[PDB]
Design a protein around this ligand. Sequence first.
Ligand SMILES: CCCCCCCCCCCCCCCCCC(=O)O[C@@H](COC(=O)CCCCCCCCCCCCCCC)COP(=O)(O)OCC[N+](C)(C)C
Ligand SMILES: CCCCCCCCCCCCCCCCCCCC(=O)O[C@H](COC(=O)CCCCCCCCCCCCCC)COP(=O)(O)OCCN
Ligand SMILES: CCCCCCCCCCCC(=O)SCCNC(=O)CCNC(=O)[C@H](O)C(C)(C)COP(=O)(O)O
Lengths: 589, 84, 70, 15, 76, 47, 80, 109, 51, 225, 75, 93, 66
Amino acid sequence: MYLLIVFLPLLGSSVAGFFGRFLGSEGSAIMTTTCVSFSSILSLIAFYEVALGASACYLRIAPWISSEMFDASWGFLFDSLTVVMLIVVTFISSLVHLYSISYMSEDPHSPRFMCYLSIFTFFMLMLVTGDNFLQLFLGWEGVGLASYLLIHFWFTRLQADKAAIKAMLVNRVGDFGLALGILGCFTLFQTVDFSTIFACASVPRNSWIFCNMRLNAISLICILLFIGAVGKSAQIGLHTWLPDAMEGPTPVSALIHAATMVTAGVFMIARCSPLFEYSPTALIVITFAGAMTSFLAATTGILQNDLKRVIAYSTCSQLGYMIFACGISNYSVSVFHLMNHAFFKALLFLSAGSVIHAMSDEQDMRKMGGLASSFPLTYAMMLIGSLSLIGFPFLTGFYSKDVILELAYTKYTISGNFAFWLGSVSVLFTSYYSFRLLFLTFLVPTNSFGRDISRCHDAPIPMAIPLILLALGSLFVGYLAKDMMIGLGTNFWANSLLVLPKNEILAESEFAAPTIIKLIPILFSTLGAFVAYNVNLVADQFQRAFQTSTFCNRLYSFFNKRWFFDQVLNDFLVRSFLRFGYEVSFEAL
Amino acid sequence: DDHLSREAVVDRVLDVVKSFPKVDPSKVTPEVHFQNDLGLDSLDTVEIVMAIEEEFKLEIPDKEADKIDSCSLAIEYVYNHPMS
Amino acid sequence: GGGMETNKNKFIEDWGSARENLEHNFRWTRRNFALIGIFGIALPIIVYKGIVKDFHMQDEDAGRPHRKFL
Amino acid sequence: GFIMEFAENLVLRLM
Amino acid sequence: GDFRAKVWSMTGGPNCRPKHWRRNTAIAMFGVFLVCIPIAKLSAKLEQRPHMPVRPIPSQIWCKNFGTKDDYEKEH
Amino acid sequence: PLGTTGEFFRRRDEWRKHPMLSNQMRHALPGIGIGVGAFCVYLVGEQ
Amino acid sequence: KKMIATQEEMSAAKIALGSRDMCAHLLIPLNKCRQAEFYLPWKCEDERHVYEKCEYELVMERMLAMKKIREEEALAKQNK
Amino acid sequence: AAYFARRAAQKERVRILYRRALKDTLNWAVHRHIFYRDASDLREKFNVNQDVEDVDRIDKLIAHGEAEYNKWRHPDPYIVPWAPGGSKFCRNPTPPAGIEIVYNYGLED
Amino acid sequence: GITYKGVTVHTPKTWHTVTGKGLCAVMWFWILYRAKQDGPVVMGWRHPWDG
Amino acid sequence: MFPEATLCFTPFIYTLSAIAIIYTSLTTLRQIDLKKIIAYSSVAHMNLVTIGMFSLNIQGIGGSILLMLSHGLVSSALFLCVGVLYDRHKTRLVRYYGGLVSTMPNFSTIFFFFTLANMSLPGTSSFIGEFLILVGAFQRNSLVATLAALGMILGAAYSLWLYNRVVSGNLKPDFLHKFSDLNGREVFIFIPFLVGLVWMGVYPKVFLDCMHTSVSNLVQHGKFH
Amino acid sequence: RWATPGHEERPKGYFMNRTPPAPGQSRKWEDWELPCYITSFLTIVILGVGLNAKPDLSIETWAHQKALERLEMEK
Amino acid sequence: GRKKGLPEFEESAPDGFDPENPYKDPVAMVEMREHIVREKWIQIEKAKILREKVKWCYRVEGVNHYQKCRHLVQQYLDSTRGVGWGKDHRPIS
Amino acid sequence: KPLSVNDELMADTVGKYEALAWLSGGLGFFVGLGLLAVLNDKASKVPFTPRVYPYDNLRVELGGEP
Ligand SMILES: CCCCCCCCCCCCCCCCCC(=O)O[C@@H](COC(=O)CCCCCCCCCCCCCCC)COP(=O)(O)OCC[N+](C)(C)C
Ligand SMILES: CCCCCCCCCCCCCCCCCCCC(=O)O[C@H](COC(=O)CCCCCCCCCCCCCC)COP(=O)(O)OCCN
Ligand SMILES: CCCCCCCCCCCC(=O)SCCNC(=O)CCNC(=O)[C@H](O)C(C)(C)COP(=O)(O)O
């Protein structure tokens, strides 16, 4: 019953990709959607059985790499953490499959798209249900492969190929960090199994000679592992790939970027928590990286005019929040916010795709307006998603983000203060750009063309069922899972997550803090909403400053062009390496 | 899903050129010259060409945008374009 | 046109020939000397010193004296 | 009777 | 276009819609069921549950390795 | 609406005042009336 | 507050490390009833509120001591 | 020749400048209600100068105009999705014509 | 569909408007209902039953 | 045969192998010939192998033997793909090739699979040997393992970039217009590589267990303790 | 859209790019196919029936029954 | 013609190999090398059984694995000091 | 039109060095905030004493000597 959870997407992909010429564009959708949906219901029973019944299952098929002591078998580990990720991956994937049935109804090469989606789902299930660091690494690299294959699904384009290759380069540096971390894990414990490493993760207190430096064994491994999460989760160092990866189909952005495969780093940190807990130095780095990311993405996403690109810096900011939530050594809250965000970000992407598809693939917010009356369903669905995203009271983004923000205040240390400040300003910026997206797309006087409005069709049935299910999720799931995950003394996680007695601050987060601290996000959100209304909906449009002030124009260029990361990084690393590889290596050697 | 016929193009282009403050909508034949039949400024020709561009949702490359100086050429260009 | 063979272009073909005939384009200029004496003479020495010193520090941590890696 | 038995007793003979 | 109707691909090509995709879809589903049966039978055998469930769970109908590794001191 | 250029472009956009597209602030909050009514019924009915 | 939950019974309930504070004795029945109610956030209120009152009492008793020691530090330095 | 070439070419560069300025002005002022005043002022910039009749002084005005436009140009302008540089460009392009596929390529004897 | 000046806007089907209004009304009612339940707790006016 | 000399010359082989892995992989990006890009993908792999042999442990020496076989299959399959391209179209410049995904789909799939194998992707025979060599070298010198690990980064760069030129993209009917996908011989020739590359990549325990008795008598020859 | 029968009667393009044989005939095999198919059959037979039937002689099986025997005798 | 069963290697240091001068009797040298390899593999598969014990102690116990597996963890990490042909920690076998 | 030798690899309002300066300022903003967080010294203003667990801070239950 548990191999069927992991292998149904693979069997669907091996029938929709090898024999798609006999099934056509309809059978290749039915096969994959049915297989993924059956995997999703099996994941629902797995949740009823492993997480609620509190009986984990450990399933080993065969040994994969059996050296003298390097043993990394084909093993699957279903615990509370694994199943929480399953009920998210297999449900969002099953809804994206149904969405693509109506989204890819005119695209010629629909069967290959569904095959790629199923193979991505299978690789994500291999990642989450991993017993070793290698079966985890197998999924970790296969999932990036599937992302690359899906970004340039339209191979005829050139921007798609550039984005796909950039994503692979960044993910490969991430896999470099992860590979070094895995090599470090074996050098201490002489095993890659999660059970043995997490059982023996407290004894080692020795030092290594790493790259001409004497470091701490556990700290070095934790930092190297966190490098992989930085690569995959689009953190401060390595994030430029994610905004450019929007050149793929909308269901691609909603699945492999919004919900999953960016939460792979967060999941890896949360699972390796019985190891990260014994390296306090690494936690500081994680907190700082998350704080920096949550502010950089928020500052970058307030001046974008592309509908899809705004909903990517939102994902980057939420990932920064989740990452520095792990930095405060509270992994339950991180996974709770991960599961919450995988509901109101997939909804946002799906609704945005529904708007774009109906508007003849128009993606610029400057060229849509007054769509609220024309698009009632999608307007409501974007309202729900945006209100969840900003953290509206008593909603799905309120039960996790508020906890994240109050936890940083009670972490009385230098690293915690930095994270609290940055994650508090990021709330204001998130509210501003979210409400700007809402206002420009739906409520401003119409700025579109006559032809786009004339050809308007709201979401049909296959693209509305996933939306409605995600809306119900983003309405209720946060409240439903508030108690089991971030409650006091909860045993839902069992042994999945380890928080040492020394660094646990959950009780103080609720009752040690002034009531004002529990209202700062709710006030910054209102301030951002007011600013976004006053600069867009009723404004004399003082933009003349952007045409007379040299600094204002340069400042506008700074936020628009992603803090000048791509331009500087290209010119100073990529061009330099390309110049090397010819001018020295081939020319004179 | 059908490229609109030539006369349908004529209707909208003539509507656009007709709905201009400086021009006289008294006689606007499809075979007229902006700077020789209607007697307009040189610059306002650019405005009419643009208003044609957004109306049909098509981007004219800037080089041949100024080549459009008569209602005749405008219709032919916004007609031979398939994506319009 | 009943041939699968490519219609070779004189510009691409001569470009490829020039890009493959770089053997007789060494000119022993100070830029070539710099590129052959830095990334061919210094970087290997730096790397070799790195491995040797890494072995030395591994030796000293265990208490064993340094090994004559020569 | 079944191929595995003969294969085993043949590989053992070969070795 | 015209030449893309003479290219054989496993996926099927652009805008592929065979005359009998219904029957082919049924056959594909039935074959997937027949290949998933042995996978389920194998999974019900190699699965290990060290902990008895809080409430009767459906996996106690086929799986039999419930509360078996409790004597871990004799593991191999 | 001022100048020859402004007058021209303003006169071209006389279709933007389409009734379905003209005012969208009145539909900013879709179901606030029904939700508030149902909540009031719940609040009064309980006692 | 003097401990009531001994070591063996805390192990039997498998209370997560870090939750084995002075409030554990109330945690055992609460965790028993969360599982029987599928961790629903509106079934086990009587048990949850008692445990949360225990936690709040602990935190307040600790904050009062911290305020007292900070006041002692302040009193000595400025009265030098 | 100058009476038809050295002057008239500027009478075409000016059309170029006006067009790129108008599109940029629409790009900066997102809302249509605001674009009208900005466009009116933009043409007022050109309209006021039409008093010029001598090349000795107009040419540097055109140079300064291009310099000014290149400074206030929108960092991210608007491109039609199917236009070159757009987002729908080369999505599912029409396949090239004349490309044939041969059968039984590698067959012994 | 209704035409004002050439351009026409197709009226949405009844299913979409009803569903959107229903979901939004459910959202508002749920927010208000939750506010009446634990709003004072978030406000800091009264503990769950802590004190 | 020479236990005393191998230990003294170990840093030398590590330095040469690391600089070769770096320089060759950086040079590969600037080649234009199809067969000169793959022939530069073999030097990096064969210099990654000589790190494993000189590590003198079961994971190093034992993983080098698997990387040798995996290379002998993957490179010999990529050369077959290049020969397929050359036999029909008498050219090897990457510039002439593009858009083959629309006219030669089976060849595109096979070329993609062997490109994935070439970049040491898990589930393929190359990843097993690569990771075994890395874990066999980290145990001896942490610095050389990092330099070898940048090798997979550069390999995964150029391996997909080559495929992006050759398979994906728009067709160029001005250069070449007639096409023919893989024949009967070609598919059957590629099959034993497809089956021998996954069989060694998912269950490499069939090959490993035949060598541990012999690769362990090699790891210790001069040592008696 | 999910009811109408398809237009493509048979998959576009011939498999392995070969013109299908004359009616009432068969695809005449080349001079390599039979000697290669019998070899690709005997290979699978030998590997499957040979590797799964050879004795489990190894150093990881002999030692797992010699360490499992002395790890017990220490008690 | 091997006989059905596991391989039979005699477990005894080959007489003649005296470590004062290893290259004296070549026959004993190869026998000694094979023997040493054999006990190193024995001490590897003995350290893997302890790893299995630790693995199934971390899973059966759960949260209490810090006190119920302490004996197994230290035994495993003590039998992992001198595994074999690994880190610089080389046993004097 | 012979092809260039480097014909295999082929934000216009900014230059590489100027954009690098802008990026350095933007990233030095983070360093300034970090130094401000250091100057705040939140550790010295903690309002509760460190939590003290029973049974000698759960020594036995955390792997300590029995
Ligand atoms: C090996 C471990 C990792 C496995 C990853 C699997 C990911 C897929 C790998 C192959 C992807 C194929 C990409 C290369 C070819 C590019 C597209 C192509 O041309 O392939 C054909 C053939 O279709 C396929 O792509 C089939 C290959 C993938 C489906 C079979 C894969 C089986 C499942 C994945 C492997 C199972 C194990 C994975 C886990 C180890 C599709 O043609 P069309 O979609 O109709 O469009 C082409 C245009 N024109 C029609 C004009 C020619
Ligand atoms: C139509 C194809 C279309 C594309 C297909 C894509 C790839 C699909 C095939 C994937 C690979 C299939 C191979 C199975 C891999 C997983 C199973 C591993 C094999 C296995 O476990 O059995 C071992 C060998 O027996 C065996 O079963 C061996 C039989 C395998 C025959 C493979 C023939 C490959 C020919 C390659 C020739 C070159 C070889 C390289 C030099 C015995 O396991 P054990 O020893 O532990 O038993 C202990 C008992 N005492
Ligand atoms: C992004 C920034 C937006 C742009 C900001 C402003 C940039 C430009 C500002 C500087 C431009 C000027 O003032 S100078 C540009 C125009 N100024 C003149 O003095 C031209 C004199 N007039 C003529 O050449 C002809 O009349 C002609 C105009 C061709 C009409 O053709 P007709 O003879 O048939 O009517």
